[PDB]
């Protein structure tokens, strides 16, 4: 399984800074065949970012999108628009959207289907909250989210899907899950995939860990058998930091 | 009161079409001192649109934004990013956001304030549901949204704000309100603005009607004394149609 390290800038940056970032990084990123290097920037910057990253291994992703191809959805961006722009990845179901913008498992599922329909690789986010974790419902919660998100896909598509396990309590908190625990949950996710789509799909689908991943600990996560990469927020904002992250995928 | 016609493309178009649209229209839009012509396009296209429309009377707007300048809001675009790009207008609280993406009066207000503190002219949407309408709560519902949305502003900035009354039941349904009725609702709104910010602000603030506005009925709405423009959806997608709408502003 080829590792995939994705940077989620969230709502940060200015066009100029976004371009400089890609500019300083696009050339020193590992070769595509060794690591999937992704930067998910704000909608406003995608156009120039795709332009700047053209002819390099740096891949550009969106932090979200709608499920419909077009329609009366003021403010939403469609997968058609993203594909057309040259965006290749899209983050779906990030806890931030599930918590504040009414993103549900149902809409995540619709978007996941829409992603594969429009040629975008989906990075599906799942994760338990502190309360769920403390109630020992982690596996059930994560299983349920993964099941509903992948519902309707063929095993061939699941192979290309990317699932990002991100315990909500670990996002931007400075408290990350231990590699062992994260590996266990990711192993459970892979197992859930295996029971839904077969061992072949589960052996190919890449599962990332996300939540306070830093260039000083990505290796610990990446080293785990069930963890194929990292979804990185805070530590993906600086070019130097980002480079260290993707570098660990080699 | 200078009329203002804003086109809300919603989630439609591709970058190329959007650029062609601006190119075909930018130089044939009425003089800015006569009518404010605005195009609110998907986040993805703003950059190129702003560059293309630069130096013309065609203004570019966003369909929404978050209220924070930056932060952990995956998928959101901040007012800072928009201003920086050169975007002048932003639609806020569109009924589509309110019913589908957890947009509340509280968040709209936060955005209205963010817009003003960031140099963006907000087009604040309000409107009643078919139910609320059938239950004679139209004036109440609309007055409530307008009060909460504007709460915190000074009379000086309220003068520069734009309110867009849009009967939810009239949006994209082909069933638009009657000019008389819309004039009543808008009249009520203006009164509310007066009772809260004084008459000087109530007479300057521009109130648009929105919902199934077409080139063949826009004049009937602009004719009304309380209606200073229109927020147009479907009829704003075609360049030729958009030009007719804005021409009615003269």
Swiss-Prot record, chains A, B:
<feature type="modified residue" description="Phosphoserine">
    <location>
        <position position="212"/>
    </location>
</feature>
<dbReference type="GO" id="GO:0046166">
    <property type="term" value="P:glyceraldehyde-3-phosphate biosynthetic process"/>
</dbReference>
<comment type="subunit">
    <text>Homodimer.</text>
</comment>
<dbReference type="InterPro" id="IPR000652">
    <property type="entry name" value="Triosephosphate_isomerase"/>
</dbReference>
<dbReference type="InterPro" id="IPR013785">
    <property type="entry name" value="Aldolase_TIM"/>
</dbReference>
<comment type="similarity">
    <text>Belongs to the triosephosphate isomerase family.</text>
</comment>
<feature type="binding site">
    <location>
        <begin position="8"/>
        <end position="10"/>
    </location>
    <ligand>
        <name>substrate</name>
    </ligand>
</feature>
<dbReference type="GO" id="GO:0019563">
    <property type="term" value="P:glycerol catabolic process"/>
</dbReference>
<dbReference type="GO" id="GO:0006094">
    <property type="term" value="P:gluconeogenesis"/>
</dbReference>
<keyword id="KW-0413">Isomerase</keyword>
<dbReference type="InterPro" id="IPR022896">
    <property type="entry name" value="TrioseP_Isoase_bac/euk"/>
</dbReference>
<dbReference type="GO" id="GO:0006096">
    <property type="term" value="P:glycolytic process"/>
</dbReference>
<protein>
    <recommendedName>
        <fullName>Triosephosphate isomerase</fullName>
        <ecNumber>5.3.1.1</ecNumber>
    </recommendedName>
</protein>
<feature type="binding site">
    <location>
        <position position="212"/>
    </location>
    <ligand>
        <name>substrate</name>
    </ligand>
</feature>
<dbReference type="InterPro" id="IPR020861">
    <property type="entry name" value="Triosephosphate_isomerase_AS"/>
</dbReference>
<dbReference type="Pfam" id="PF00121">
    <property type="entry name" value="TIM"/>
</dbReference>
<keyword id="KW-0324">Glycolysis</keyword>
<comment type="function">
    <text>Involved in the gluconeogenesis. Catalyzes stereospecifically the conversion of dihydroxyacetone phosphate (DHAP) to D-glyceraldehyde-3-phosphate (G3P).</text>
</comment>
<feature type="active site" description="Proton acceptor">
    <location>
        <position position="166"/>
    </location>
</feature>
<keyword id="KW-0312">Gluconeogenesis</keyword>
<keyword id="KW-0597">Phosphoprotein</keyword>
<comment type="pathway">
    <text>Carbohydrate degradation; glycolysis; D-glyceraldehyde 3-phosphate from glycerone phosphate: step 1/1.</text>
</comment>
<feature type="binding site">
    <location>
        <begin position="233"/>
        <end position="234"/>
    </location>
    <ligand>
        <name>substrate</name>
    </ligand>
</feature>
<feature type="active site" description="Electrophile">
    <location>
        <position position="94"/>
    </location>
</feature>
<dbReference type="GO" id="GO:0004807">
    <property type="term" value="F:triose-phosphate isomerase activity"/>
</dbReference>
<feature type="binding site">
    <location>
        <position position="172"/>
    </location>
    <ligand>
        <name>substrate</name>
    </ligand>
</feature>
<dbReference type="GO" id="GO:0005829">
    <property type="term" value="C:cytosol"/>
</dbReference>
<keyword id="KW-0963">Cytoplasm</keyword>
<dbReference type="InterPro" id="IPR035990">
    <property type="entry name" value="TIM_sf"/>
</dbReference>
<comment type="pathway">
    <text>Carbohydrate biosynthesis; gluconeogenesis.</text>
</comment>
């Amino acid at each position: 399984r080829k590792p995939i390290i994705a940077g989620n800038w969230k709502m940060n940056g200015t066009l100029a800074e976004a371009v400089q970032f890609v500019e300083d990084v696009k050339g020193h990123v590992p070769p595509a065949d060794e690591v999937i290097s992704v930067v998910c920037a704000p909608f406003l910057f995608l156009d120039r970012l795709v332009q700047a990253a053209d002819g390099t291994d740096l891949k550009i992703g969106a932090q979200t999108m709608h499920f419909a191809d077009q329609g009366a959805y003021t403010g939403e961006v469609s997968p058609v628009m993203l594909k057309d722009l040259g965006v290749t990845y899209v983050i779906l179901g990030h806890s931030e959207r599930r918590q504040m913008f009414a993103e549900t498992d149902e809409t995540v599922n619709k978007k996941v289907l829409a992603a594969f329909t429009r040629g975008l690789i989906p990075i599906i986010c799942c994760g338990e909250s502190l309360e769920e974790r403390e109630a020992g419902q982690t596996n059930a919660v994560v299983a349920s989210q993964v099941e509903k998100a992948l519902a309707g896909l063929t095993p061939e598509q699941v192979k290309q899907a990317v699932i990002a396990y991100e315990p909500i309590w670990a996002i931007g908190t400075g408290k990350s899950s231990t590699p062992e625990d994260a590996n266990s949950v990711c192993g459970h996710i892979r197992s859930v995939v295996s029971r839904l789509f077969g061992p072949e799909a589960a052996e190919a689908i890449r599962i990332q860990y996300g939540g306070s991943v830093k260039p000083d600990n990505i290796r610990d996560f990446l080293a785990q058998q069930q963890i194929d990469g990292a979804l990185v927020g805070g530590a993906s904002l600086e070019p130097a930091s980002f480079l260290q992250l993707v570098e660990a995928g080699r």
